[PDB]
Amino acid sequence: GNAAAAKKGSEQESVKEFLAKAKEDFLKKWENPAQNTAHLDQFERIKTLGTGSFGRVMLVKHKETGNHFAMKILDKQKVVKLKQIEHTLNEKRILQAVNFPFLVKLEYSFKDNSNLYMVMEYVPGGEMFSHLRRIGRFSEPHARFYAAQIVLTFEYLHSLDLIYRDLKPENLLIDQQGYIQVTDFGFAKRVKGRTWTLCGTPEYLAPEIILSKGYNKAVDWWALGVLIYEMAAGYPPFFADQPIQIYEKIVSGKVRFPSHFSSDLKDLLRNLLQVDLTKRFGNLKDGVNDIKNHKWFATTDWIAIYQRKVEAPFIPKFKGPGDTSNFDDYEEEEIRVSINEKCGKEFSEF
Amino acid sequence: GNAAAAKKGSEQESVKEFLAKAKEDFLKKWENPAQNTAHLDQFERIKTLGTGSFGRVMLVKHKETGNHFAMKILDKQKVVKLKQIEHTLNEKRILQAVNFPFLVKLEYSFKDNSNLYMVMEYVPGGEMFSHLRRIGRFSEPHARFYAAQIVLTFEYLHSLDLIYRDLKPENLLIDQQGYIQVTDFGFAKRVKGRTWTLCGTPEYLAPEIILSKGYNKAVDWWALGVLIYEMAAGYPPFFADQPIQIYEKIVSGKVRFPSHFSSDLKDLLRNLLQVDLTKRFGNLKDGVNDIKNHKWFATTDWIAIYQRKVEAPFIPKFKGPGDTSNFDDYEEEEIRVSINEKCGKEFSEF
Amino acid sequence: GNAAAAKKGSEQESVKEFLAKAKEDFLKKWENPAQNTAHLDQFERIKTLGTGSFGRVMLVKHKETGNHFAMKILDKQKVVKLKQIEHTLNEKRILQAVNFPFLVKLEYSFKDNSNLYMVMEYVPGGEMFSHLRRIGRFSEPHARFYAAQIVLTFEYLHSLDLIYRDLKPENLLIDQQGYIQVTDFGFAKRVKGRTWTLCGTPEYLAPEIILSKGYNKAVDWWALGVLIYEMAAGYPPFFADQPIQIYEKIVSGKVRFPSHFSSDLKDLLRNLLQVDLTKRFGNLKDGVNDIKNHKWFATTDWIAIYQRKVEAPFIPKFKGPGDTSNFDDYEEEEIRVSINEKCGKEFSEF
Amino acid sequence: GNAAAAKKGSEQESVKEFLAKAKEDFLKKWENPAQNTAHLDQFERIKTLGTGSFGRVMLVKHKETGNHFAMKILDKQKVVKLKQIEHTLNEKRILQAVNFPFLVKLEYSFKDNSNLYMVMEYVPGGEMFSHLRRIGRFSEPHARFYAAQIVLTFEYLHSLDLIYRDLKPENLLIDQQGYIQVTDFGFAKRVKGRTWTLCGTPEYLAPEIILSKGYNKAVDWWALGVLIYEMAAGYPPFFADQPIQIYEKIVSGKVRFPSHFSSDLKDLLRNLLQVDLTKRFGNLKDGVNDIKNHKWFATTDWIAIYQRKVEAPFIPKFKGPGDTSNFDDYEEEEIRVSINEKCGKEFSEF
Amino acid sequence: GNAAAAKKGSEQESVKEFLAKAKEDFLKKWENPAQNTAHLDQFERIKTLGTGSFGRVMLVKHKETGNHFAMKILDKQKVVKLKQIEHTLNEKRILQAVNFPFLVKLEYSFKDNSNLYMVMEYVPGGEMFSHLRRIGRFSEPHARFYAAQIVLTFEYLHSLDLIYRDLKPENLLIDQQGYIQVTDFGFAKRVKGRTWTLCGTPEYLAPEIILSKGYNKAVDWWALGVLIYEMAAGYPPFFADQPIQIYEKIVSGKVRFPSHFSSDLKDLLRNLLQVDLTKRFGNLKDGVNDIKNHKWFATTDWIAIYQRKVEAPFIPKFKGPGDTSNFDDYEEEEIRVSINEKCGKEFSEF
Amino acid sequence: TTYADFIASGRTGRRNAIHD
Amino acid sequence: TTYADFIASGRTGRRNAIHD
Amino acid sequence: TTYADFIASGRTGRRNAIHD
Amino acid sequence: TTYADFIASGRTGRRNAIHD
Amino acid sequence: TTYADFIASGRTGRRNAIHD
Amino acid sequence: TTYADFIASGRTGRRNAIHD
Ligand SMILES: *C(=O)CCCCCCCCCCCCC
Ligand SMILES: *C(=O)CCCCCCCCCCCCC
Ligand SMILES: *C(=O)CCCCCCCCCCCCC
Ligand SMILES: *C(=O)CCCCCCCCCCCCC
Ligand SMILES: *C(=O)CCCCCCCCCCCCC
């Protein structure tokens, strides 16, 4: 339960076993990675869904199943020159090792002479980001629905010794049913203990990251505070034109809460946007349960949300049968793969 | 339950007894029909709700109860000349014999010299059809809500040896609360075994009907496939300008699923829009439970839906206090009934 | 439960104890009132939220907690001249004595030389009134959600021997989460038995009030009938231009129900808009349970609603970060408090 | 002018010369047709805009100009088998001969072994039809704007001895600026005098066509009556389920005008939906000027409309940069043209 | 006229004299500047409209007239440290010297010990920018309305030897009536001949500016091309993530026009987004009249637009009586001005 | 339908309370 | 009002032309 | 802003005429 | 996408039943 | 209200990540 | 269509001016 009754007891009994089966499992895939699961002829290319720094994302149809995926194609040379080899390699390992309702699923991965291909599940509703910016702000029920899902996602990731390091609306894809799916595990790190890299988006940096003092999984609960605030408010708690000014403001931590924030919402936020890590929720004795048992979460049944059985506030209805319009009617390219294998030993572990 | 726990056990235990009390009951009314339950002076005529081939549908107010019904008025001569005597007679018998949340209730029936009157419950939200066409397509949660209700309606109808034979959005009226009510039992047949009539709307014909080979209750699970597809997609799986071309396409059964269909939705649909009846869901060993226990239905509690206690995605708010505007401000007629009784022995069983 | 199972048994077992702890409690605060709980320097004034006959309502921020309240400021002289001393005094006593989910909370109260200040929780979504008038009418599910909450509010108030005497959409504030909060306890009376004052809004007067015959808590169940009707219909059951004509119509009690009202809705309403108090629901043997167990309420779980754990149909998203726009960008005043204490002995009990 | 002043005098002086230069001109192109103006390599294929009975319409980009056209591709064999050779040939001749603001321009035409290609200007706003059906009905100013444009189009066509024979919303494309462009000159006929073919859409058939008595250019003014009525009303004046019933109603000509039709609109319509051709407007002594000088047209300056300088009520904003979404993300074909020239002598005049 | 008739002759005769009276006039104010026209006590402060790098913009009410202005307040020290002294001084001189319908009017200017105050007319509809981003793209009629107004604004500015140097949607404020008002004359330069400064927004830089080769008034006609394109398309012709990549693309000048652009729109744009200045419109022999007499402008009467007598496509209705909500309910400051005069000799010419 | 009656009375706005 | 009739016929969609 | 005042009076509905 | 096909057929309106 | 500040910064669009 | 590119850059918000 969330607190069914003292069936809260069964909630916790269950969470406990669940997460134990989960470490066993991750550790096996983590420590013995699954590798090169398919090839390009198996997929019809439908349209370009997008275009990036290492290449395109494509809507593809797997020919045996008649199912649709989004294919991220990465040119080896481009990732090598952009010095993204280790981020790429790391994202793939994490992704093929992990398994939760709300993480986006890496369906297949393979390389070929030119390109690395990570075929993921296609989540047509898009990111939370644009919906949030078109709608303006989300009601505290809508915003709590999503909060509940991320708490659970972080409870799981952190048990596998994974700090996500990149929460914001742009990595939270909304699916068919109206539930979150987190994308981009390129800054996640499996770290037991403390680390030192400057990474995220400025807005969501916890004061320790900015301060270069070393940091841990407690950065993700500070970014849940930034996230609930921007969902329920419209805009981030600390934002500025220049990043260094955003930082300016973050290391002071002086937040003004909107008057329509409930006393209750404000007080969850006061302990997630905590600067003292000895007072930050999710980083105290009572771990997540300090967050999970806050009165803003009082009407949330954590098992119902896990089970995907709550009714979603909003389901996106992106327009355009087959090919959409927003996704986009781009100028279609060839995907050329070469007569020779480029970058073989760097991407050898992929 | 849907699968409460192994309270799925109580779901099924219960469904089992329910349906048993149901056959007992139908068989009594079926085999000894209730007949001529009221008369015209009992009703104030408010407005014409519509006009058909055998006559008008009227909004009427029953004077003792102060309650509103929709009165279908059929001119005996017109039904006789249109050769609809047996369809009419059959619809009435079925209707006065059957009893389920989601079927529209025949409140009273009587004839008089000229006309037969079937007074039904008034469901002001109208058909699903127009709502569907104004909205464009329905989210897989919205579309599954309705699917759940029809699965239950067909489980019940088929246990009473009734094949509905006419599913489409135009017979699915949405009520006050947001739940379906199926209208039009003029092509339903109580058939144990197999039948041969060409009936339905082209779009929804199962390949066997088109092929004239004989057919059974398995045609209604093929039409649930056509229905979930048109709700979740916007348009039917097979449609064309000419019916014979729709047929053309149906007997090949080559469907292309929209990219926003979930892998899961596509795979429910692959076994309801099955051409081999040895592979069509609802027609295998595991009857409906092959459908009811598909992962698209995974978050559905079948008892909650029966009990009408789920919260409805959409409730229509047709405009116009008393008399509406859409329903319609027609030119009002007299209902004339004659000095002589027309067609007495044909409609004698009514 | 609402009727969980014969867990209806636990519903009622529980309601029973709950309400017992509740009388104990109210009686203590009622009979020994809490008094003068704070002072003005403790609060930053943000904006004027509104302006009345005894003075302004202001958005204020309590400086220790960083929380927002709405401050009703009343000038003692103005209340004294408007002869509102006893209504004021009475509202405060009731308010500091009572405690339920759906009543608005009096957070602090104090006076000073000039003014009395009742600092309440800020409920930014505003009244149900304007939302209702912009939307036009509410679906019977939306309208039942609110009905369920008021039934519970009246069950509690009436157990504490309090007749509310002023139900209408303008005192039903919708909060952050989408639940009702009743404001204005200035006509409530703690009366065991019968009373005689002419009070309410014309539209909502029960025939006994108009008739000057003496009346009791049964007036509030007649006003729940007026309320469900105006929510589900758009307009009141009896309304006219002149109040005396509204009365004209109320003491005849001839209501016409809209055709889109469900047979079921109409029949709940026939016994709440009852003129014979020996037939009015909530005033019979079976108290509220005649209302709570009506088939319109059939899908309502009364504990879920109490527990605030149902999902709200509509959550208002009033616009304007901090200061809004609707709430209003007024010409800001000083709050002047004098060198001398005005009206000291009249407001002495406050 | 429309009636500038007695500058109506200059309107008419001008119309007069204009139309004279116009016959001279048409007659030259009509009697000496321009032929085979380009070839396929000159055009990049962007997307399929649609698919028909003789083939596809494609969005194409002419490589020298960087301009977009819509390419109707017709397979010679298909047109030959569908017996459309003469309609095809006739549409092309008419189209390459005619020149007016509101007719859609045939930019190039050519054939090749397999297919005939008519490259037209691309008018992205689509047909009036769907806009009309989504909006419901058009205000008499909006509806008169379009009426004014068609009056002018028919004045010109009829002077060139061309009866259009196919008016309805589906051939009236709305362009970038908000003005009409008439498509489909496949039933137009250059007939001096009277003809006998059954052609149009049922709804728009003038009683003479139905009656098989012979008919002339007066059929197009009856179809302007059907058109203004469906624009200003929502639905056609005579419509039914079966065409033969539509005819049923048309040859009686009993029209009921909506109550929101202005007395003035009703009276223009009474003489365009005239059954007696001796009383039908546009067919009397005063030709078009009976229509052009009707009080519904009183505020219309006919030269301003010609000159495209009035401000358009509505400009469609179809969505989807490059490729749209509505136009459609189809499955793209090859256009195959053969090693051999099919149907050479039939399409020889093309 | 635009081309009334050969009243085009009177258009041009008139434009000619107009612009002559205009140079006479500007030259007088330019060469003898009006200076220090009022003081702060003359104005009631209403609300903060915004906050910048040199300070706030405030809604102010001039006490004699009861009229509203927007007061830009600049702290002398801040402008001195930001090295903006000459831009500030220059903007003011230009602004007090110039006079056209579509430029925003500097109503008063004064300094005081601390701050410089430029009181401008208040244009509540806001920038075109956000409207454009909320609406998505503008119809070619809407977009041409605005184009017409900027052509006229640039014809005038350039005659006074002023190159604007900063066109984009964010400086085009839409007023009460729906007409443009250009703000920000901080990068305008009165230059006869050629200049060398890198200034504007990346998106709108003409290739010469990027190339550092020297440039003239022809940069503003390249920025009219960027502007008509972003209005009629949604997005800029050249945009990228990094500015240096935007530049990358601009100095190649390879633009792809949307398919819904009219052949005519595309061809105006081909000669405004010209890289060869010997082919760029507005910079050829026929000056502006190459632009003003392009067929996209064919239905534009240039005098009607000047005269403000065309009907505006869109008038913004920003919400919030007095104080708005979008403009903003900020935390209000003091404006402190000091006991001593800061920066006296630098701002001495102001 | 009395809703048309409804709109026509002034009683479509905020109703106050007779009183006391 | 026949508009309700209108919606109920199938003739609310794209009408083609009898022909030729 | 008095608009908030406005909404709060009952005088947001159809105003009749004192009279005669 | 066949949805564009869909709109273009007349079969976007109320479909009746072949029959009987 | 800083929301007006918010709109005025360029930081109303897609935010990327400093990095690595 | 590059419009999808457009949305994905941060350059969908208020653009400032390089400068001076
Ligand atoms: C309480 O209602 C019943 C317990 C059944 C819950 C199933 C356990 C699922 C727990 C997984 C939680 C995942 C969060 C990281
Ligand atoms: C499982 O939760 C509890 C079982 C109580 C369910 C009531 C049984 C109703 C079954 C009727 C199903 C009708 C479908 C044809
Ligand atoms: C039935 O489900 C379970 C009983 C638990 C309900 C908690 C009791 C709360 C009753 C308070 C009702 C207040 C109404 C005046
Ligand atoms: C009256 O204002 C001035 C006359 C100038 C009008 C130009 C003539 C154009 C006439 C063409 C009409 C086309 C209709 C078939
Ligand atoms: C043509 O119709 C009539 C001429 C009257 C026009 C008034 C002249 C105004 C010209 C000012 C143009 C300003 C553009 C920089």
mmCIF file with all atom_site columns, N, CA, C and O in Angstrom, chain A residues 151-162:
data_model
loop_
_atom_site.group_PDB
_atom_site.id
_atom_site.type_symbol
_atom_site.label_atom_id
_atom_site.label_alt_id
_atom_site.label_comp_id
_atom_site.label_asym_id
_atom_site.label_entity_id
_atom_site.label_seq_id
_atom_site.pdbx_PDB_ins_code
_atom_site.Cartn_x
_atom_site.Cartn_y
_atom_site.Cartn_z
_atom_site.occupancy
_atom_site.B_iso_or_equiv
_atom_site.pdbx_formal_charge
_atom_site.auth_seq_id
_atom_site.auth_comp_id
_atom_site.auth_asym_id
_atom_site.auth_atom_id
_atom_site.pdbx_PDB_model_num
ATOM 1  N N  . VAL A 1 151 ? 9.565  9.473  -7.503  1.00 0.00 ? 151 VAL A N  1
ATOM 2  C CA . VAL A 1 151 ? 10.058 9.047  -6.201  1.00 0.00 ? 151 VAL A CA 1
ATOM 3  C C  . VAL A 1 151 ? 10.396 7.576  -6.277  1.00 0.00 ? 151 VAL A C  1
ATOM 4  O O  . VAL A 1 151 ? 11.476 7.165  -5.855  1.00 0.00 ? 151 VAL A O  1
ATOM 5  N N  . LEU A 1 152 ? 9.483  6.818  -6.866  1.00 0.00 ? 152 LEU A N  1
ATOM 6  C CA . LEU A 1 152 ? 9.631  5.399  -7.037  1.00 0.00 ? 152 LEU A CA 1
ATOM 7  C C  . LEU A 1 152 ? 10.824 5.096  -7.943  1.00 0.00 ? 152 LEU A C  1
ATOM 8  O O  . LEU A 1 152 ? 11.693 4.313  -7.502  1.00 0.00 ? 152 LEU A O  1
ATOM 9  N N  . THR A 1 153 ? 10.914 5.702  -9.157  1.00 0.00 ? 153 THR A N  1
ATOM 10 C CA . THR A 1 153 ? 12.096 5.620  -10.046 1.00 0.00 ? 153 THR A CA 1
ATOM 11 C C  . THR A 1 153 ? 13.451 5.875  -9.339  1.00 0.00 ? 153 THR A C  1
ATOM 12 O O  . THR A 1 153 ? 14.392 5.110  -9.487  1.00 0.00 ? 153 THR A O  1
ATOM 13 N N  . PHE A 1 154 ? 13.570 6.933  -8.535  1.00 0.00 ? 154 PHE A N  1
ATOM 14 C CA . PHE A 1 154 ? 14.763 7.219  -7.755  1.00 0.00 ? 154 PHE A CA 1
ATOM 15 C C  . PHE A 1 154 ? 14.968 6.224  -6.619  1.00 0.00 ? 154 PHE A C  1
ATOM 16 O O  . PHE A 1 154 ? 16.106 5.808  -6.432  1.00 0.00 ? 154 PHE A O  1
ATOM 17 N N  . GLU A 1 155 ? 13.983 5.752  -5.865  1.00 0.00 ? 155 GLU A N  1
ATOM 18 C CA . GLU A 1 155 ? 14.165 4.690  -4.889  1.00 0.00 ? 155 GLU A CA 1
ATOM 19 C C  . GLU A 1 155 ? 14.843 3.412  -5.427  1.00 0.00 ? 155 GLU A C  1
ATOM 20 O O  . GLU A 1 155 ? 15.636 2.706  -4.831  1.00 0.00 ? 155 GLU A O  1
ATOM 21 N N  . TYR A 1 156 ? 14.493 3.101  -6.649  1.00 0.00 ? 156 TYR A N  1
ATOM 22 C CA . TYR A 1 156 ? 14.967 1.965  -7.351  1.00 0.00 ? 156 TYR A CA 1
ATOM 23 C C  . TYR A 1 156 ? 16.334 2.331  -7.840  1.00 0.00 ? 156 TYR A C  1
ATOM 24 O O  . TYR A 1 156 ? 17.266 1.588  -7.557  1.00 0.00 ? 156 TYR A O  1
ATOM 25 N N  . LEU A 1 157 ? 16.553 3.441  -8.517  1.00 0.00 ? 157 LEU A N  1
ATOM 26 C CA . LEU A 1 157 ? 17.856 3.698  -9.112  1.00 0.00 ? 157 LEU A CA 1
ATOM 27 C C  . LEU A 1 157 ? 18.921 3.764  -8.073  1.00 0.00 ? 157 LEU A C  1
ATOM 28 O O  . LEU A 1 157 ? 19.900 3.044  -8.170  1.00 0.00 ? 157 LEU A O  1
ATOM 29 N N  . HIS A 1 158 ? 18.627 4.482  -6.990  1.00 0.00 ? 158 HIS A N  1
ATOM 30 C CA . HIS A 1 158 ? 19.548 4.658  -5.882  1.00 0.00 ? 158 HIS A CA 1
ATOM 31 C C  . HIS A 1 158 ? 19.835 3.315  -5.225  1.00 0.00 ? 158 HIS A C  1
ATOM 32 O O  . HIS A 1 158 ? 20.996 3.093  -4.892  1.00 0.00 ? 158 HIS A O  1
ATOM 33 N N  . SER A 1 159 ? 18.921 2.359  -5.105  1.00 0.00 ? 159 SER A N  1
ATOM 34 C CA . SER A 1 159 ? 19.225 1.049  -4.554  1.00 0.00 ? 159 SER A CA 1
ATOM 35 C C  . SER A 1 159 ? 20.210 0.335  -5.451  1.00 0.00 ? 159 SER A C  1
ATOM 36 O O  . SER A 1 159 ? 20.897 -0.569 -5.006  1.00 0.00 ? 159 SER A O  1
ATOM 37 N N  . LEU A 1 160 ? 20.315 0.671  -6.729  1.00 0.00 ? 160 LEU A N  1
ATOM 38 C CA . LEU A 1 160 ? 21.233 -0.019 -7.580  1.00 0.00 ? 160 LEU A CA 1
ATOM 39 C C  . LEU A 1 160 ? 22.503 0.752  -7.687  1.00 0.00 ? 160 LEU A C  1
ATOM 40 O O  . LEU A 1 160 ? 23.289 0.573  -8.603  1.00 0.00 ? 160 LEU A O  1
ATOM 41 N N  . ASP A 1 161 ? 22.680 1.662  -6.748  1.00 0.00 ? 161 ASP A N  1
ATOM 42 C CA . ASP A 1 161 ? 23.795 2.558  -6.670  1.00 0.00 ? 161 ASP A CA 1
ATOM 43 C C  . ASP A 1 161 ? 23.978 3.444  -7.850  1.00 0.00 ? 161 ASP A C  1
ATOM 44 O O  . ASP A 1 161 ? 25.083 3.770  -8.223  1.00 0.00 ? 161 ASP A O  1
ATOM 45 N N  . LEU A 1 162 ? 22.878 3.911  -8.397  1.00 0.00 ? 162 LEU A N  1
ATOM 46 C CA . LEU A 1 162 ? 22.845 4.788  -9.555  1.00 0.00 ? 162 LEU A CA 1
ATOM 47 C C  . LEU A 1 162 ? 22.289 6.156  -9.223  1.00 0.00 ? 162 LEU A C  1
ATOM 48 O O  . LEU A 1 162 ? 21.146 6.253  -8.769  1.00 0.00 ? 162 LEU A O  1
#
